[PDB]
Design an enzyme around this catalytic site. Structure first.
Site, PDB file in Angstrom:
ATOM      1  N   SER A 145       0.880  -1.184   0.000  1.00  0.00           N
ATOM      2  CA  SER A 145       0.000   0.000   0.000  1.00  0.00           C
ATOM      3  C   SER A 145       0.906   1.219   0.000  1.00  0.00           C
ATOM      4  CB  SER A 145      -1.041  -0.108   1.111  1.00  0.00           C
ATOM      5  OG  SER A 145      -1.619  -1.411   1.198  1.00  0.00           O
ATOM      6  N   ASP A 253      -7.835  -2.243  -7.220  1.00  0.00           N
ATOM      7  CA  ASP A 253      -7.407  -2.070  -5.842  1.00  0.00           C
ATOM      8  C   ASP A 253      -8.407  -1.185  -5.086  1.00  0.00           C
ATOM      9  OD1 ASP A 253      -5.603  -0.122  -3.968  1.00  0.00           O
ATOM     10  OD2 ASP A 253      -5.029  -2.250  -3.901  1.00  0.00           O
ATOM     11  N   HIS A 302      -7.383  -5.529  -1.319  1.00  0.00           N
ATOM     12  CA  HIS A 302      -6.318  -4.620  -0.899  1.00  0.00           C
ATOM     13  C   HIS A 302      -5.206  -5.388  -0.201  1.00  0.00           C
ATOM     14  CE1 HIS A 302      -4.690  -0.988   1.483  1.00  0.00           C
ATOM     15  NE2 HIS A 302      -4.368  -0.821   0.212  1.00  0.00           N
TER      16      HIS A 302
HETATM   17  O1  LIG Z   1      -1.616   2.875   2.442  1.00  0.00           O
HETATM   18  C1  LIG Z   1      -2.688   2.728   1.830  1.00  0.00           C
HETATM   19  O2  LIG Z   1      -3.641   1.998   2.253  1.00  0.00           O
HETATM   20  C2  LIG Z   1      -3.048   3.351   0.410  1.00  0.00           C
HETATM   21  C3  LIG Z   1      -4.070   4.245   0.467  1.00  0.00           C
HETATM   22  C4  LIG Z   1      -3.820   5.157  -0.876  1.00  0.00           C
HETATM   23  N1  LIG Z   1      -2.446   5.174  -0.918  1.00  0.00           N
HETATM   24  C5  LIG Z   1      -1.739   5.835  -2.009  1.00  0.00           C
HETATM   25  C6  LIG Z   1      -0.365   5.694  -2.102  1.00  0.00           C
HETATM   26  C7  LIG Z   1       0.289   6.301  -3.163  1.00  0.00           C
HETATM   27  C8  LIG Z   1      -0.460   7.069  -4.054  1.00  0.00           C
HETATM   28 CL1  LIG Z   1       0.412   7.805  -5.399  1.00  0.00          CL
HETATM   29  C9  LIG Z   1      -1.834   7.197  -3.896  1.00  0.00           C
HETATM   30  C10 LIG Z   1      -2.660   8.046  -4.856  1.00  0.00           C
HETATM   31  F1  LIG Z   1      -3.943   8.128  -4.451  1.00  0.00           F
HETATM   32  F2  LIG Z   1      -2.207   9.337  -4.912  1.00  0.00           F
HETATM   33  F3  LIG Z   1      -2.649   7.552  -6.081  1.00  0.00           F
HETATM   34  C11 LIG Z   1      -2.491   6.606  -2.864  1.00  0.00           C
HETATM   35  C12 LIG Z   1      -1.754   4.090  -0.143  1.00  0.00           C
END
Ligand SMILES: O=C(O)[C@H]1CCN(c2ccc(Cl)c(C(F)(F)F)c2)C1
Ligand SMILES: *[C@@H]1O[C@H](CO)[C@@H](O)[C@H](O)[C@H]1NC(C)=O
Length: 360
Positions: A145, A253, A302
């Site tokens: 993630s 996702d 996820h």
């Molecule tokens: O840790 C987590 O559960 C996820 C939740 C969304 N998240 C994430 C990480 C990198 C980027 Cl680039 C983006 C976005 F939305 F900008 F594309 C979202 C990690």
């Protein structure tokens, strides 16, 4: 069990200034090291970070961390649970910087919070060199993630750190799980008012400034100042990386759909949403066409790699632990008979792969 070590350099901190750290289980006589970056969203302004501090404090502070954790999935030492790397030295690095592992900013009189994710990784690596990592043959920087994106942002920096420290024989590789996002249009538009439904481009544009986020140098040189947010998007940063990186990504996702303002209700799906979801999976597949080491099942889910049942999903009849073993064989010093490494589903709707996680 993996045992907690808080960083000896207490200048390298979680968001609230408490020391960052890592959990370690050594395997003497293994020269493989797996360093796993945890995920868990992020926060891109004081207001959202204050709320996260109130009700998600373990993601911002080490004050309440337990002294041990059980390794699961790819961090398990049991071969039944982890056919891939069950005998490796195992490191779990908690995510306590809320910055997608990008920050290099300390808490100060100007900053309520420290955003030090990139420095936490560097400091963990430095302190592990004294605990056996100096003898390593392979360092696999893995993460899920936000930690999967963290791998993309940091794998080449770890490689450069070890080179500069005089360890050219350690082969640094990356395993990015559920961190390969599209900077796409939302299904219904929201203004960027809180974390989870802020559109991808806006979230990163805001975050990189608030965190003083750092990105890989070759990607920074392409996009230049003011546009480094681009380098958080796997399809843009990946071609700039030198370290081998295996990409694990569900085609649908759930975090991608959340930032896209899609909530699947179990209710009937109308044409506009059907087309949106089908085009999302096709776009994701397209971005992986030229990624030779990848595993991308057509599921709505996820994060795969530290779940105990990570063994169960297959693409084209091959599990992820098998594909990762095939990847290891491919990096021994031409494709391999019956041992594929590029495994991307082609079917167009979530759960068209029968092996998708059931949600049970
Ligand atoms: O840790 C987590 O559960 C996820 C939740 C969304 N998240 C994430 C990480 C990198 C980027 Cl680039 C983006 C976005 F939305 F900008 F594309 C979202 C990690
Ligand atoms: C602690 O980390 C900071 C930032 O990475 C670095 O400047 C400093 O030299 C480190 N301290 C020690 C004692 O190595």
């Amino acid at each position: 069990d993996l045992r907690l070590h808080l960083l000896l350099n207490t200048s390298v901190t979680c968001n609230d200034g408490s020391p960052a750290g890592y959990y370690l289980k050594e395997s003497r006589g293994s020269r493989r090291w797996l360093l796993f970056l945890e995920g868990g969203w992020y926060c891109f302004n004081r207001e959202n970070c204050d709320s996260r501090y109130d009700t998600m404090r373990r993601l911002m502070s080490s004050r309440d961390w337990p002294r041990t954790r059980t390794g699961t999935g790819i961090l398990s030492s049991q071969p039944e649970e982890n056919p891939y790397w069950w005998n490796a030295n195992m490191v779990f690095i908690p995510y306590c910087s809320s910055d997608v592992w990008s920050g290099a900013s300390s808490k100060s009189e100007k900053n309520e919070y420290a955003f030090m994710g990139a420095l936490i990784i560097q400091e963990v690596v430095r302190e592990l060199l004294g605990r056996g990592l100096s003898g390593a043959k392979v360092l696999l920087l893995a993460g899920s993630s936000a930690g999967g994106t963290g791998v993309l942002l940091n794998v080449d920096r770890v490689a450069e750190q070890l080179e500069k420290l005089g360890y050219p024989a350690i082969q640094v590789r990356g395993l990015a799980d559920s961190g390969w996002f599209l900077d796409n249009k939302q299904y219904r538009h929201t203004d960027c008012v809180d974390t989870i439904t802020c559109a991808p481009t806006e979230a990163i544009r805001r975050g990189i400034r608030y965190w003083n986020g750092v990105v890989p140098e070759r990607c920074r040189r392409q996009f230049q100042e003011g546009e480094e947010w681009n380098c958080f998007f796997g399809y843009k940063v990946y071609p700039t990386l030198r370290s081998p990186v295996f990409v694990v990504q569900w085609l649908f996702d759930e975090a991608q759909l959340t930032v896209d303002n899609v909530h699947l209700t179990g209710q009937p799906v109308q044409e506009g949403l059907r087309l949106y979801i089908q085009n999302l999976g096709r776009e994701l597949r397209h971005t992986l066409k030229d990624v030779p080491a990848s595993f991308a099942p057509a599921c709505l889910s996820h994060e795969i790699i530290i779940r105990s049942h990570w063994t169960d999903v297959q693409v084209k009849g091959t599990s992820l632990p098998r594909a990762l073993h095939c990847w290891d064989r491919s990096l021994h010093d031409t494709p391999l008979k019956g041992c594929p490494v590029h495994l991307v589903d082609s079917c167009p709707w979530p759960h068209c792969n029968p092996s998708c996680p059931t949600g049970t």
